[PDB]
Design a protein around this ligand. Structure first.
Ligand code: CA
Lengths: 210, 224
C-alpha cells in the first residue's frame, strides 16, 4: 500500500512538499519513485522519475527526493496551473508499479470556507423496502477537497460507502455527497451511525440513531 | 505529435464483454512497451496490463488475470484490451499508455491517451426509487429546516428534480449524482424551508427520469 496525503494547499508563490510512503517498509532509491501530474479534465503527465530526474520540459520548480523513509515532491514557487492531482508510483516488485491514492493540490485563490454537513437517516419507507441508506450531504467548502469517514457506533465502517468527488457550486464553493448502505437489521441493531467530514485538518461529525 | 486514442469502451452489463482498442500514432509504436492503466470514478490510478515490443510477453495486475487479455498489432498500430468476465471493479476510465523505456524493470509512463470510460452497469435502463428525507433543523439556520428526496438506483443519467411542480425554487440544492459500484446512479435534492411551514405547506419533489419513462412525485412529511 502506497500512501499519499489526500490533499494539500499552497499559496501562489509558496512552497509545498508532497510525500509518498509505504504502509509496511521504508521508501528508498530502489523503489525508483515516479511522480505524475493530472490537471483537471486532462490525462496524467510524467513529472519526475528515478526519484529526482525531471522529464524533458518539466519546470525546475518541481524537485523529487527521498526523505524520512518516503519519496517527496517539492514545488518551490507554486503557480496557479500547478493546481492538480499528483500521483506517485513506487516499484515494489515485478512486473509493474503501485500507485498512491493521489494528492489534490489546491493553489489558493479564494478564502477558506468550512463545510456544512447534513446527515439524514434511512426513511421508514426505505426500511419497509428492505434497504437502508444514510445520506451525508456536504456543501459550501473551499478548498474543494474533503475526506469522509463513517462509523457504526464508534467503529469505522468501510464497506457500503459511495462518495462523490467534490464539484463546484453556483457560488464557487464546493459540494459533495456520501452514502452509506446498510441492511435494516444493521441500522436497527447499532446505537448510532456517524458521518465524519475532514476538511483542512478540521472535522465535523453528525450522528443519527434508530 | 503523439496520439493514443482509445475506443471500444462504454456501457456493458456484468455478463458482457468489451474490446478496447488504442490507435497509436506519431511515434514508432513497435519500439515501446505499451500499457493499459485505469482510473476508477473517484479513485487513483491502477496499472492493468502491459505488453513487450513484439507481443510475446504480457503482464497483468493480479485482479485482471484470467479475465482480460492484452494484445498488439504493430502494423495496425493498435493496442487491444479484451475485457471478459466483468466486475464492478472494472468501471473506470481506461488509458492507453506508453512506457518511455528508460528501465528494464520499472515502467515509466511518458505518454497517455485521454482515456475512454467503461461502465459495468447492472441495468441498461432503470427508473429510480424515491425516498423522502424527513425535515431536520439540527444543521440549518435557526427557524429553518432541511428536507429532501433520495433519488436512488437509476440509469442512465439524467434525472430532473423540481419541488412543488416548480412553485418552490428558493433554497433548493440538488447534488451531483454518485455512480455506485452497481453502475447505477443515486442523488439527493434538499430544500431548506421555514420550520413553521412544516405544519401547513405540502412539500413534494417531482422526479423525472426520461430514459425509463418514470415520474415520481414524492410527498415529504414531518416524521412525528
Ligand atoms: Ca511497460
Amino acid at each position: 500500500v502506497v500512501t499519499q496525503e489526500p490533499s494539500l494547499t499552497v499559496s501562489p508563490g509558496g512552497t509545498v512538499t508532497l510525500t509518498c510512503g509505504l504502509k509496511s517498509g521504508s521508501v528508498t532509491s530502489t523503489n525508483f519513485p515516479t511522480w505524475y501530474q493530472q490537471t483537471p479534465g486532462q490525462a496524467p503527465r510524467l513529472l519526475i522519475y528515478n526519484t529526482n530526474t525531471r522529464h524533458s520540459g518539466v519546470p525546475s520548480r518541481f524537485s523529487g527526493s527521498i526523505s524520512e523513509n518516503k519519496a517527496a515532491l517539492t514545488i518551490t514557487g507554486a503557480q496557479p496551473e500547478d493546481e492538480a492531482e499528483y500521483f506517485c508510483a513506487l516499484f515494489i516488485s515485478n512486473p509493474s508499479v503501485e500507485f498512491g491514492g493521489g494528492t489534490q493540490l489546491t493553489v489558493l485563490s479564494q478564502p477558506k470556507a468550512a463545510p456544512s454537513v447534513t446527515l439524514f437517516p434511512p426513511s421508514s419507507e426505505e426500511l419497509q423496502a428492505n434497504k437502508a441508506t444514510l445520506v451525508c450531504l456536504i456543501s459550501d467548502f473551499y478548498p474543494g477537497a474533503v475526506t469522509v469517514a463513517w462509523k457504526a457506533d464508534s467503529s469505522p465502517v468501510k464497506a457500503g460507502v459511495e462518495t462523490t468527488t467534490p464539484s463546484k457550486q453556483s457560488n464557487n464553493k464546493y459540494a459533495a455527497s456520501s452514502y452509506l448502505s446498510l441492511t435494516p437489521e444493521q441500522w436497527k441493531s447499532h446505537r448510532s451511525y456517524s458521518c465524519q467530514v475532514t476538511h483542512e485538518g478540521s472535522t465535523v461529525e453528525k450522528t443519527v440513531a434508530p | 505529435e503523439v496520439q493514443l486514442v482509445e475506443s471500444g469502451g462504454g456501457l456493458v452489463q456484468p455478463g458482457g464483454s468489451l474490446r478496447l482498442s488504442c490507435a497509436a500514432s506519431g511515434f514508432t509504436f513497435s519500439v515501446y512497451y505499451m500499457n493499459w492503466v485505469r482510473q476508477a470514478p473517484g479513485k487513483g490510478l491502477e496499472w492493468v496490463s502491459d505488453i513487450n515490443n513484439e507481443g510475446g510477453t504480457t503482464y497483468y495486475a493480479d485482479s485482471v488475470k484470467g479475465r482480460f487479455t492484452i494484445s498488439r498489432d504493430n502494423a495496425k498500430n493498435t493496442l487491444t484490451l479484451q475485457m471478459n468476465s466483468l466486475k464492478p471493479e472494472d468501471t473506470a476510465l481506461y488509458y492507453c499508455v506508453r512506457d518511455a523505456g528508460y528501465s528494464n524493470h520499472v515502467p515509466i509512463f511518458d505518454s497517455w491517451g485521454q482515456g475512454t470510460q467503461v461502465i459495468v452497469a447492472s441495468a441498461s435502463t432503470k427508473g429510480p426509487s424515491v425516498f423522502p428525507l424527513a425535515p431536520s433543523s439540527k444543521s440549518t439556520s435557526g427557524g429553518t429546516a432541511a428536507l429532501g428526496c433520495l433519488v436512488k438506483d437509476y440509469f442512465p443519467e439524467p434525472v430532473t428534480v423540481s419541488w412543488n411542480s416548480g412553485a418552490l425554487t428558493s433554497g433548493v440544492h440538488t447534488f451531483p449524482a454518485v455512480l455506485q459500484s452497481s453502475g447505477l446512479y443515486s442523488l439527493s435534492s434538499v430544500v431548506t424551508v421555514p420550520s413553521s411551514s412544516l405544519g401547513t405547506q405540502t412539500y413534494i419533489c417531482n422526479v423525472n427520469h426520461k430514459p425509463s419513462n418514470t415520474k415520481v412525485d414524492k410527498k415529504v412529511e414531518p416524521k412525528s
